[PDB]
Design a protein around this ligand. Structure first.
Ligand SMILES: [Cl-]
Ligand SMILES: [Cl-]
Ligand SMILES: [Cl-]
Ligand SMILES: [Cl-]
Ligand SMILES: [Cl-]
Ligand SMILES: [Cl-]
Ligand SMILES: [Zn+2]
Ligand SMILES: [Zn+2]
Ligand SMILES: [Zn+2]
Lengths: 422, 422, 422
């Protein structure tokens, strides 16, 4: 039934490629926490999955936060007297500080310098900067290109707008047999950078695309929203729905060649933590698990004391990686096998969530005479521990065995009627 | 009082020898899960301890199981045209597959070969095979002897019977001051092999023989029954008695030169687990402790969810050892010091079970002025932790001290009336 | 507020010197469990802090103990025929066994020898011996000096008295906002030895001296009493006060050049254990933590089952150190930086005890938009874990961060009204 997910896991190599192509299509667009770039991004996503798109008015109070003004940008450049655009937004949108106020000026190098940003230690990288909440403006460039700049009169143009508007977020909901809900979120505010965070956006899109085709026990909600402000906005508009969210994962940085990393929920041993660590344990690659900390991505909002949901984060090279928030986080930094593997892992997690049943041994008094009914070690564990209190995940953990081994053992026993679902 | 066990522990070397002699006497007899071999074995045991012998009719439903037909064997052989018994049951009863249907045939080597069994990797071993529940027949032989066999017409004789009869089990019960019961079980179905399982049979016999002579707090029951089918049969006939079984041990593989191994109860930290690991910890030899798993010996039946007793297994080289289920598990594989040591350890376990009291310090407000009443570190622990909630085993564990040190410290304090038994 | 303790911690080097000078002043006085030496010691202490001095009559029943006779000593010596005091109390009070009955005799070397005590393994040390509860007398001397002694007639004089009198103990109480009480005890019965225990006496004096000048939340009691008999006497006279003692520390051996050692309370994870281990963890030096054992110093009386308070012991080189109970434990064995460091650590412990508050995040629904109100990682932890159930110590532990970092983060949040004290 959910065994239908197996073909998706088996074709993950090909899907890693499709996930990459979506990243490549999204790459050039200038996202921020608001704006037409976010809207162009939602359009592209809706070529793959349905979404309901929400627009929350600037000035709307979302718990302690206020929905900001909307920002947009047509062009930006620093041009020299010889006419050459020595900095050009059209070449890389990381060249402009996100939320830059509009500017049109002539300035000398010395007057421009304070608004220029480089990375001296990596003379070839463009730094990514933002200024969402204090009015400001900036240009980023490589140190190497900075070092070649002259004393001169430069035309400085940032053709932007910062006006009351609205904040875009997208949402897709799959109704399962049950209202209990698994939440998968990712953030849409980063512009032309790949691991952080076109990888999460493209991954969650394809997970949604696969789940759409299956009959699930749980309901699944997929949130695409700007980081921090988006999740706060969503929570402020959905307090009624929180009681059903059983578990969740924030997807980001899921595309590079490195090993998988799992950040636990604030509780450390919630069902989702136990499920994800059990999948990693038996997956055959290296991985690393970290405890919760109240910074990083939107798991901070979901794990606030007043929200208090079980949300972790399954990543590859976690944010902080070398080149993050710079132009080094580009298309060639994406790895197809990495994307394939992250997608496969998420699907295995979902398969585990769905098939984590609890059973009662219908012949608890000594073992049954296996043979009256037509992997024996797994079976003996399932019979032995199915007192009504142990889940298959519990048995997989105590036995040290892989989850599917336990599951298939339980299937076989259920067929010969030695188990009742409870 | 139970201090009377000390002389038995001190004479364990001599007893290891007596335990060996019982093994040697039992060795030649052809046991199976039923049959006259089991009966001859119960006769020999009753030369040492009393037993009540039970016979359960073939076809009796014992929980999900059915008591099998009774199997017996007079002779078996493969004879060549020259008249030579190239396989001879009288030389080793491992040469016949247990429960072999009777056969009387002439066959060529090629027709015989499929019913012949060897161990290619150990060209000198006879494999032990059984076929309790599907009708069948087989001969085991060494690969080396197989390799010397000719194309020929062979007379093939297995003079056996497989008929409705009854299943034998033996039982000995010692009444203590209390009905709470310690259960010690071993299995009687293996033929001419020593570690698995004449060692458990001879050991438990001698433990019973020693306990018989002592005034015990607990009641003790000793079960001698075929593996699996015997324990299921016993449980099916004694549901009324299960509420009193406080703890138990299955004895097998207790006779070789290797280190001691303890398999825990399914609960992992039951009183018996804590007691056995505390004895091993301070015993002065190497040992290994394993967690429960629902296969191996009869602890699977006792640990079924519907029975759910605390039964572990104290062994030497656990089943799976090199040569197990083969003719290599012979008399020379038994080691007297091993048998002596296993017996000593079981007695120390029993001494601990019996003397694990709980006391109340009658002078809890500061330490007493020791000197008003005529190993001080042990004493201070006993006084300090005897609030009515801590057992001597608890104190031995927290103090890191050996159990007898704590016990004797508690004795001395009880004498000067600084402790109340509670 | 308690931030006023910071200047005392910052001036600890100078205070280590003052603590040393008190030790030096106290060093020559002949303390025992009773006597005028204890009284001279209380006089000197009262030059630094107020004390209430108690005198409990010999023969008074203090729980199971009896207050002993009072012992005093004017002079003691062994003199040879040539007139030379070959042993002289005036040179070192360790030369006389504490509680020595008075003696005035002429004896030959062979008759004297059984009452002489040396340390053969450290031919230059005077052993410290006592005989509080059986009547007796002895002289201690170096092996080297013993080896130079002649066959001779020696005048043997111990000018002492052992008569019904009273047992002295001193006590100082600081009333805090709350009656809940922190108890700091030290023992006054050791004569001319420094680490054991003029160091505890001088340290606790200076802690009392500093706390006296601060407005504390908790009440603080400082007990100066002979070991064992003194604490039992105090407990027997203050059962009514025990319900308020939240935590406590016994100070001894706090003056040498070695690393800090913490002995835990019998509970192992009481608030005081958690506080002291958290201070050590981040203090920047090596340390060692030990579990409770019911011997050593007065934590045995406080941790009796009938008293059952949370009292640990924060030391440097714990009793048992090389030279302990000998003349090697002298002034040069005291280290100023050691004394300074022990005092600083005790003050940091007290600062932690006082500032370990519990708060409620007043904006629990998602993080606040920090910026509406004017070390961010610490702050995010405090906001995230302040659900009303977590103390700052809890947050410091879970975050792995140093306690003051958490405290100051909590201060800042409290100021902008994002936290309620609960
Ligand atoms: Cl939808
Ligand atoms: Cl497995
Ligand atoms: Cl009987
Ligand atoms: Cl010990
Ligand atoms: Cl006072
Ligand atoms: Cl820190
Ligand atoms: Zn980022
Ligand atoms: Zn076997
Ligand atoms: Zn001492």
């Amino acid at each position: 039934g959910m065994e239908e997910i197996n073909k998706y896991i088996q074709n993950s190599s090909e899907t890693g490629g499709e996930i990459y192509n979506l990243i490549e299509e999204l790459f050039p667009i200038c996202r921020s926490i608001t704006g037409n770039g976010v809207r162009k991004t939602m359009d592209i996503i809706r070529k793959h999955i349905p979404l309901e798109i929400h627009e929350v008015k600037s000035g709307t109070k979302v718990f302690d936060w206020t929905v900001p003004k909307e920002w947009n940008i047509k062009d930006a450049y620093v041009r020299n007297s010889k006419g050459e655009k020595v900095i050009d937004f059209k070449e890389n949108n990381l060249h402009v500080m996100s939320y830059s106020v509009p500017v049109h000026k002539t300035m000398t190098l010395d007057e421009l310098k304070p608004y220029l940003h480089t990375i001296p230690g990596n003379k070839d990288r463009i730094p990514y900067l933002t200024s969402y909440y204090k009015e400001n403006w900036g240009f980023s460039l490589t140190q190497n290109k900075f070092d070649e700049l002259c004393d001169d009169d430069y035309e400085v143009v940032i053709d932007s707008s910062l006006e009351d508007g609205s904040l875009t977020y997208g949402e897709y909901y799959i109704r399962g047999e049950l209202e209990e809900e698994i939440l998968l979120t990712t953030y849409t505010c980063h512009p032309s950078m790949c691991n952080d965070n076109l990888s999460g956006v493209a991954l969650i899109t394809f997970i949604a695309k696969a789940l759409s085709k299956l009959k699930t026990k749980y309901s699944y909600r997929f949130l695409f929203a700007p980081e921090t402000i988006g999740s706060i906005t969503w929570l402020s508009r959905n307090e009624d729905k929180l009681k059903n969210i059983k578990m969740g994962l924030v997807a980001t940085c899921v595309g590079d060649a490195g090993i998988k990393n799992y950040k636990r929920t604030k509780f450390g041993d919630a069902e989702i933590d136990k499920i994800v660590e059990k999948v990693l344990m038996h997956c055959g690659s290296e991985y690393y698990v970290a405890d919760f900390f109240p910074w990083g991505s939107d798991e901070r909002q979901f794990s606030s004391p007043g929200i208090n949901l079980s949300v972790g984060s399954l990543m590859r090279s976690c944010y902080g990686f070398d080149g993050y928030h710079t132009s080094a986080d580009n298309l060639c930094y994406m790895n197809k096998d990495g994307l394939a593997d992250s997608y496969k892992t998420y699907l295995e997690v979902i398969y585990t969530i769905e098939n984590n049943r609890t059973y009662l041994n219908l012949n608890p008094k000594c073992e049954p005479q296996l043979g009256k009914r037509g992997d024996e070690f797994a079976m003996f564990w399932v019979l032995n521990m199915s007192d009504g209190k142990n889940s298959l995940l519990d048995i997989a953990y105590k036995s040290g065995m892989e989850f599917r081994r336990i599951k298939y053992a339980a299937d076989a026993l259920y067929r010969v009627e030695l188990l009742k679902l409870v």
